[PDB]
Symmetry: D2
Subunit: 447 residues, 4 copies
Amino acid sequence: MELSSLTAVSPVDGRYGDKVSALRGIFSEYGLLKFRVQVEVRWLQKLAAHAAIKEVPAFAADAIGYLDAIVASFSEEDAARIKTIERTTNHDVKAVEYFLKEKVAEIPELHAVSEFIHFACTSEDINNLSHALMLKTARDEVILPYWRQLIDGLKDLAVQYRDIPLLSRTHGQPATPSTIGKEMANVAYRMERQYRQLNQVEILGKINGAVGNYNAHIAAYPEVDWHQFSEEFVTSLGIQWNPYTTQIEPHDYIAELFDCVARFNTILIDFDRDVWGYIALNHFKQKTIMPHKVNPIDFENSEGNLGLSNAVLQHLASKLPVSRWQRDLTDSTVLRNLGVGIGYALIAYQSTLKGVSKLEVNRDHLLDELDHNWEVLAEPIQTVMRRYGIEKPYEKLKELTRVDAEGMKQFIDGLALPEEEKARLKAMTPANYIGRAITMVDELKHH
Amino acid sequence: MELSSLTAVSPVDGRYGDKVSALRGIFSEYGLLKFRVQVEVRWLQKLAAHAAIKEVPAFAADAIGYLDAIVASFSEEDAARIKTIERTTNHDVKAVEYFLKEKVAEIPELHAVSEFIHFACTSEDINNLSHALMLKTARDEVILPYWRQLIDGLKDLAVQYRDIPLLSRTHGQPATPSTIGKEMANVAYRMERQYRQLNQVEILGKINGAVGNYNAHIAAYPEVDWHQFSEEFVTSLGIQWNPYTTQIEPHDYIAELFDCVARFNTILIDFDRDVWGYIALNHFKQKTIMPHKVNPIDFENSEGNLGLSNAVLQHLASKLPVSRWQRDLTDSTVLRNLGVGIGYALIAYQSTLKGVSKLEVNRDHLLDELDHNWEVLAEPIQTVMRRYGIEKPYEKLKELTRVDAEGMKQFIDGLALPEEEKARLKAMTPANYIGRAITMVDELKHH
Amino acid sequence: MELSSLTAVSPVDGRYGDKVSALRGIFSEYGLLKFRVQVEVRWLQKLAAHAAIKEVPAFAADAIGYLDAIVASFSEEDAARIKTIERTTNHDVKAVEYFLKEKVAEIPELHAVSEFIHFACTSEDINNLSHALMLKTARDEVILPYWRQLIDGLKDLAVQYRDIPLLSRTHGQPATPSTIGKEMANVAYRMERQYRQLNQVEILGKINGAVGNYNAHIAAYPEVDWHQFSEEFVTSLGIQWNPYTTQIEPHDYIAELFDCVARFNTILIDFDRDVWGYIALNHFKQKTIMPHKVNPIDFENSEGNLGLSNAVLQHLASKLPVSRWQRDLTDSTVLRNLGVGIGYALIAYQSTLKGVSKLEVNRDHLLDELDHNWEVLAEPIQTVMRRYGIEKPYEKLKELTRVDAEGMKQFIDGLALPEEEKARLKAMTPANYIGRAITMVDELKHH
Amino acid sequence: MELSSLTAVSPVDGRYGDKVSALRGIFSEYGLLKFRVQVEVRWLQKLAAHAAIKEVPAFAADAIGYLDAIVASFSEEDAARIKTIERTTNHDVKAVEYFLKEKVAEIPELHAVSEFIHFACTSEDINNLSHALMLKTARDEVILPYWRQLIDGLKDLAVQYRDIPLLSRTHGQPATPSTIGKEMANVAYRMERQYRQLNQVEILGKINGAVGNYNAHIAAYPEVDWHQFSEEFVTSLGIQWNPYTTQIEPHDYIAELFDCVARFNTILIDFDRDVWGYIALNHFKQKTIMPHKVNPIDFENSEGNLGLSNAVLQHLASKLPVSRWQRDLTDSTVLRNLGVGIGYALIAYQSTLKGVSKLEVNRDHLLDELDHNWEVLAEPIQTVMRRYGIEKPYEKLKELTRVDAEGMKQFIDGLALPEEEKARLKAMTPANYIGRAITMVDELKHH
């Protein structure tokens, strides 16, 4: 059968193909070919711009324009042409070289130097730079924008429910109260940490020949400083330079990128699960469009896809940086999967965002539950007792802990405490015993 | 951009889409929908066949024929119709129910009982059975046939090179000789063990309602033995019955299937790596189509894809069997990836088979290397010395170990051994000191 | 600092050292040395018993007795002696050979053949057999007994609470009822499947020299059938024979053993989490020693340790079977960790057993919750409506779904159903709408 | 049996216990208890130093001295006392509180405020800070020093063999030459990147009560700024402040630390494997103490332990940051394993360092192999041909590629190239065709 969303083996291109359309122009073979073209064209352009390389004279504005067009207008038909050529070359990078030669055949100035396309390059010089451009593009145009949406989403929830009290759950049971907003704030803060880290990860690239020593370049042009050339070229692409490599770029930075994405994903899994739980406890209800139950399907879909994402991201991170001697070819096929781990993540991010838009706190339920857990006030009573030197505080409260407002008031009135403090204690309720929760939500914007 | 092999994010449907075409009819959404239809149709058919369920009278041969046709002729257009219906139902299983009702609307006998389609079923009753059929189909029609091809491939190599001596490598260095064939035989044997295990894995299915107790069935038909009904139905599909489940089939058997596939994959990774190594040592050369080097690209492609396969298979195996209480929905989206792990494996199996067809032993190199490692004969000399009570054998050989034929002959002649034994030792060479290697290759067919 | 439970880096020997004392005699270096001694002694014994090997005459009953004593009485002091000897040999297997020679030096009949200890053996011949004995011992004497305890524990809970109704939870929300016992039964059934599988896993061993071809054996005794000898020897130890290996036993069976242990562990993780959840919902309370909350700490400790266990078991399963060419030495140090993954599991098994002994159902809470979820009866009403041809059943119930007994009774009375069926429907309550749950618990003993 | 290095289940405390002695004072229960004491003592000290907390007056120099002594002199006997107390409290943190009260009972000034020990703290306030101190200590005193040793080790090899030519291996076969030193340099560079990253990882800590809102603190002292107090306290310990948490510190930073350690470990695995390979190819020989083979056992031991390390580190990194609601207790037992992953790493680091000290290049072998692979000069000949516009360079060389010096000289002399260039090409040999390799080794010190 022909390939369609219905027949695709993987749901990344199948059932969820529409959800990851942005990656089709980045991590697919079309994306790979698009960036290989960009790299090769820029390489030829630098050769021309370099005065010491006389065989490739400087390009005029028009010539530079024709080349820039080949790069900026690269279409599916162009990629299809490269694939056609590959049926004969049986070498994908070679297919791109021939493709560019065809595109330039009509321009005498460009056709005159067409044999300098890919000059002294090894296939990996082109490939690793293509991979870096794909990852950088994915990060700046896709991943970070979704992360900001999730972060702003959580912060919107934190602010909206900043003062909604919540009977906390430690080891699944009633504990010292907090507020819904504060619990959302905690997540936003963690996400922000990973956001800053992902944004600071270096995206590396190299260009130095067959095994990393510019052997071929120096043989042809011994007077040219190819080390300087390499650094200038990589940096001109908006990529950070990796001066020491073998035939391949080592891939350590890919592990760095994927490790931070995985950490963020883990935070989201934690969030999806906690929300699923709050819904199970009836703390959230369906947002108005009698309380209606909200189906957590969106958080479960996200959770499921986040697990798949980390599994793939994790594998590439740990396997890619291991390559026999000056390199084995196992990374070639593996690197065609850079967008798979990211694809699972994108599907999950959209699902969580969808689920978040359906959340509405069930204030009445939250408050009613709190009013049935006066045992939580044992904590504040103990610290006040301890402050005033009352002996065996924990022991006394243990004996005290059925507990209700009246039972607590009577216990407090019987304590050896100044009247002012007794009133302060008799003034608290599980619902208002939330500490600094609200102010902490308000301060999130300062971090 | 539209989905095509060029734009697909995942190479399973992208660059390697053609290599996994067999899975398009099994694990894709089309495959999922095809089996859901089979399940629903058979369920209706059993209801009709059951005399106690009067509301659904027995079907005549013609009616049964119309239904069997819906199942056997299920096309992409049918799946596309289900998807169209899903845009309105927003429920995939519900979409199948409506699809079947439409297909039967024209047949009065079938249309008369159309409301019994999916009777008392929960979505998972249909889904888990669809998953079992997909896995069973994949196993019997795709995975095992590739495994047999690899096994026969290794056995063909074992027999062909049964008597080609090899200087073994332990901790990467020269060791007691074996033969190329014997080393291939070792792999075939291990593969066979996993083949038998995969073939013995139970493929489970269930059908028992919302949470596994036939609540709905018993409510409508309290006189029918739904426990017996369930067992008969599942077994009639060629699936093994799982009597105790919650809303979902627990998925333990999926882990069992995937664990055996992963073990086989690990054996193949070991094989791909060893062959890559033998090629590096120049023990293999390009098969005739002066020795020509064989490029190990096929084994490297296999190795890379096997790592991805295990990562996915591993994740599903460990995550699927964990479902909150009577079930959470995280497995729904994850189960759409049953064919992803298998897809990576298939790509690898084909790559290894391709690589194997290019192998030719470099007999001259193997023999020359052996003739330069006479140190290996220290071992047989020591055991013979030990057999005849010659003291400090290891110490004496240590002092002896440059070593060549003449040096060994002289050492042997100076030993306190019966003449007959001295000749036996002086008759061995690294090339013929291969023990029982050849006979063991010949005996593989007995195991 | 010296090693003690307090200073141990790993909690397996540290905080939880007492919990895994059984493994100290199996997987530790003492255990490793104990089994190496057993293997070597039995090897010498078979050499003596073999008439064709004249240099080692048959042992008299007394001699056999002295040897059996060395094996059965192996003490920590003996192991300490081997370690002392290892300081000089810098080879652990060699240290055992010398140790045995010392032990036999006083017995003339044994000392006369002391140089045949380890005859023709390579270190791995001894090591792999030691590993098999350690795993077999651990399985039959430790792992399976704990599994049976857990299984019987779950079955005791299933029977005790066979008829305690439970409002099921699907995607964390109210669903068709079941009983506590049935939910426990589901777990017991899954555990039993893994128990049978673990018990059926083959524990393999080999003995065939440096690289697996009996080279050294044949060189010394060409008239002896060493292939038959090997099979008889391995099987005599109670181990299954692996005829085809390199220098090492491939380790596939270890992956098979660990994969089944991991599957069982995953089922237990699922159980620990679900119980943690039931406790959170107040379905369980502290068993009598007003309902008292039970702290789930035991299930959480189990859950945590099960994750660590699988991580270790998983790593050994996937890494051990990969060994470069005729073997690399990475498995030597890794195989010293066979008991680590098992140790984490044992700690968890004991924790879950401890937690289970504290469970008591909170019947009043379970029943009260059910009585507040009459929406669950929409399901049985729909199937009965469907059975009698009442149109748009789902649509009508949707409009109907606040819901209480009276609301349902009125809806049912207004249905076009025979009086007998209306009464059957009006007779059900969420508490009694449990389907076949109870009978299924009673039938568990038949599977 | 009692615990000893011989009976320990785990080799981290068993066979390799001596190799990780440094961790016994950090990650063991003794280490955990030592830091809990430090935390509690400092907390009491800050309470005293805070003027607003009148109930705990400022401590005099002598009192502060007595407290500092309890912290700095914490011994195994002290830890043993805490364990003894724990037999009664059945709560480890509570045991520390009682222990400190006993230690201060004799000092009236301290005993007078002894009830303020642990004031308003929840167990995790103490535990998370203890974990941060353990990780920071391990990083600065143990991990980084080993990393520097490995880095300096590789850099020493790079410089020593800076000009030793090497026939590179891509896909295991001959490729463009490099030098041994350059290949060592590549590793050093990668290690340095991870070193800088590990050193920049934030080590976080928190202190804010039961669920993170200072509820208890504010209840007792509403006039004190506990948010400021928390930040000052954590930072005073040399730890970075994490303002937003639940009952537990989220553990994201632990994943960050472990991810960087794992990346470094992966680089080392790559190094261990490559060296194992170079040894297999006879490029390295035993350093003088005729070429003697060096046994790679040290690199294999390192490789094996690095795999175990990553498996453990990986599990904690992905599992720790997931905690149900305000926290579940699964992290408590898991956090007792912080030193296990690190322990496996330390064993490996020492093994690689040991192996490195045995390496000596086999210059004669390296040069002889190069002199038999003149095919590598096809590359430089092609780029020079391309520079001068000679058509079909690749095609011509293909036809040319047996190849020796004479064959190349004749091919070059027949080319349409200026005489000067022909001589430059005829002047190269595989041994001197190393590009910029040497200069790149010399420049490593600048990065």
